[PDB]
Amino acid sequence: KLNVAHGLAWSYYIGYLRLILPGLQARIRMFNQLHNNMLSGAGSRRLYILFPLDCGVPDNLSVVDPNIRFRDMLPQQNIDRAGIKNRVYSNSVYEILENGQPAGVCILEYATPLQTLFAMSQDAKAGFSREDRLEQAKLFCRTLEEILEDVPESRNNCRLIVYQEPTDGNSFSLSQEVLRHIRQEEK
Amino acid sequence: KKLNVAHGLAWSYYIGYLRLILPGLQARIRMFNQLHNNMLSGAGSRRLYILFPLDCGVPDNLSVVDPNIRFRDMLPQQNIDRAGIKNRVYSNSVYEILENGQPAGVCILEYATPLQTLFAMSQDAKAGFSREDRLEQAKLFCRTLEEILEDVPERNNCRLIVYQEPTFSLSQEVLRHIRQEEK
Ligand SMILES: O=C(O)Cn1c2ccccc2c(=O)c2ccccc21
Ligand SMILES: O=C(O)Cn1c2ccccc2c(=O)c2ccccc21
DSSP, X not given: OOOHHHHHHHHHIIIIIHHHSTTHHHHHHHHHHHTTSSSOSTTTSSEEEEEEEOSSOOOOTTTXXXXXXXXXXXXXXXXXXXXXXSEEEOOEEEEEEETTEEEXXXXXXXXXXXXXXXHHHHOTTTOOOHHHHHHHHXXXXXXXXXXXXXXXXXXHTEEEEEEEOOTTOSOOOHHHHHHHHHHHTTO | OOOOHHHHHHHHXXXXXXXXXXXXXXXXXXXXXXXXXXXXXXXXXXXXXXXXXXXXXXXXXXXXXXXXXXXXXXXXXXXXXXXXXXXEXXXXXXXXXXXXXXXXXXXXXXXXXXXXXXXXXXXXXXXXXXXXXXXXXXXXXXXXXXXXXXXXXXXXXXXXXXEOOOOOOHHHHHHHHHHHOOO
């Protein structure tokens, strides 16, 4: 009775997070010496994954919020493990503004399986309603969170940021949500 | 409706890897032919082969899996910046396949990564499943993928080699496929 969301969560963990998280702190260490310690404390150490529950496709990190500003690429990560033979990965550091002030800095990215989930909704043969897509998106999140909890070392370096985007609201600030999560990790 | 983990995996493996690696594929081959005397001269040598062992096994590392199958060199590195992925480099490996202790052919060879996720999913205590359930999914993953690539002829860049263990050699199994595709 396992469904599409379940396979997406597992695959993303085994297929991406597994490869990306263990080298994370070292990658950050190098960055801080290199960049005068932007990635200052907890809340800067984690890899933040954006998961918009959206009727539509989310905006690029470059455009989505003026208060979200690309600062620097993290050092590259080299992968020669398992199925993956000599693959190079990268992560971006963003400055987060609040009230026109630098309010946070962190490593931020969308969850790639969104693209896929999306494509599966559009496909004519087995396409499923926006309601059905969201159903699957919600579950993928729960399932992925449930995975991460089991594995604390992977879990330490990683946070899921899932939020509803109002299609029709005057204001949603991605920056505020991120700050909200970064600060919420008081502990 | 009736969708399950295999479908999910198929689309992800296409949208997440195949879609990124297939389009640049032919340009990559040309440089290599230029790099090493037109080694991948024909069809069957110009396509990407995704190794899919139905018996999960290991699945044994290609460098170690068979003597007749041996690593020759990398295809030229592929750079990706499209979609949600940015600033990534992808690597593919060329293996010459010995026959009678002699090279019958050469090609680009790799195992299907979703196999690892399928195996991992089985081990989880909650909702974890038998090999038989795992087997059905690995299969369902094949057919599901299969349908998708047909829908994109844009296909002739890659094929699947799926095989169970002797009820046997990989080299002879790969060769069967590379030999079969006459046109
Ligand atoms: O993000 C990746 O590194 C590769 N990758 C995935 C890996 C696992 C599970 C799903 C996906 C996925 O849907 C996906 C979609 C678009 C691009 C890359 C993707
Ligand atoms: O093959 C990849 O590039 C990444 N990748 C995937 C991409 C898409 C869909 C599934 C998987 C997957 O299960 C997987 C499993 C282990 C390692 C990498 C993996």
